[PDB]
Design a protein around this ligand. Structure first.
Ligand code: EVG
Ligand code: EVG
Ligand code: ZN
Length: 257
């Protein structure tokens, strides 16, 4: 029953998920002048050469491109991370118009959308165990700005017509998520949470500084999806972003000078 309408949107979630008002909630505004360069952070290692995409699913809140995470095929390591984190899925959050949609903001700037590549720490053995641990997940966040098309996004855009409504899925094999990355891997990092219920405080956030450019026609196709199920009154899937939460007692670290 939570969602992104007036009646069940982010300002309501705390009633069922009281950790919504916790001490390490996400997303947050990244104040670029306050984030300190940490010459002790490593370069991220994004090792997607062996990624196995399987399926795309409209879950009623976003669409997820799911991967085979039963072995170490597509992993995130390095950066602020200890150990190895397996890619399980990616998804986006976006707006009704290009001036909003991202969950993190940069000096209060909102981007048209934000991609989240979700990985879990193999030392916990499965995703459901990893979300119960403060170092269980690593989510790589990438901003989308509207300009030139992103060629590696078009395969995702073109299948959306087949998963319009909640509970629909489609085969989605052989998709290479390296085509969704920007040139640079410079990033900010901080400890946070899932941004959807149950809002668990289990995420090391790694947010890339360089946005990727996507076309207006590409993000318009995201906005044709539906929150509702088949044959239900149409509620366009737009504005499925949680706003910035209080930073509290946390420090955002930059990987770059
Ligand atoms: N807390 S919640 O967002 O799941 C909800 C259910 C009904 C109203 O608010
Ligand atoms: N949006 S996100 O990447 O923090 C996420 C993954 C699973 C639940 O919430
Ligand atoms: Zn997300």
């Amino acid at each position: 029953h939570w969602g992104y309408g007036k009646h069940n949107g982010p300002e309501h979630w705390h009633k069922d998920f009281p950790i919504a008002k916790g001490e390490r909630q996400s997303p947050v505004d990244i104040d670029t002048h306050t984030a300190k360069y940490d010459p002790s952070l490593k370069p991220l290692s994004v090792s997607y050469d062996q990624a196995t995409s399987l399926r795309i699913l409209n879950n009623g809140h976003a669409f997820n491109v799911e991967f085979d995470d039963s072995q170490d095929k597509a992993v995130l390591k390095g950066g602020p991370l200890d150990g190895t984190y397996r890619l399980i899925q990616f998804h986006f959050h976006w707006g009704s118009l290009d001036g909003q949609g991202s969950e993190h903001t940069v000096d209060k700037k909102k981007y048209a959308a934000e991609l989240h590549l979700v990985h879990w720490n193999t030392k916990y053995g499965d995703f459901g165990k990893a979300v119960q641990q403060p170092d269980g997940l690593a989510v790589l966040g990438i901003f989308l700005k509207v300009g030139s098309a992103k060629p590696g996004l078009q395969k995702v855009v073109d299948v959306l017509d087949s998963i319009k409504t909640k509970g629909k899925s489609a085969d989605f094999t052989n998709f290479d998520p390296r085509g969704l990355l920007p040139e640079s891997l410079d990033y900010w990092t901080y400890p946070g949470s899932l941004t959807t219920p149950p809002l668990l405080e289990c995420v090391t956030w790694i947010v890339l500084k360089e946005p990727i450019s996507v076309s207006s026609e590409q993000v318009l196709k995201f906005r044709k999806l539906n929150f509702n199920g088949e044959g239900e009154p149409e509620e366009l899937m737009v504005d499925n972003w949680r706003p910035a939460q209080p930073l509290k007692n946390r420090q955002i670290k930059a990987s770059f000078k």
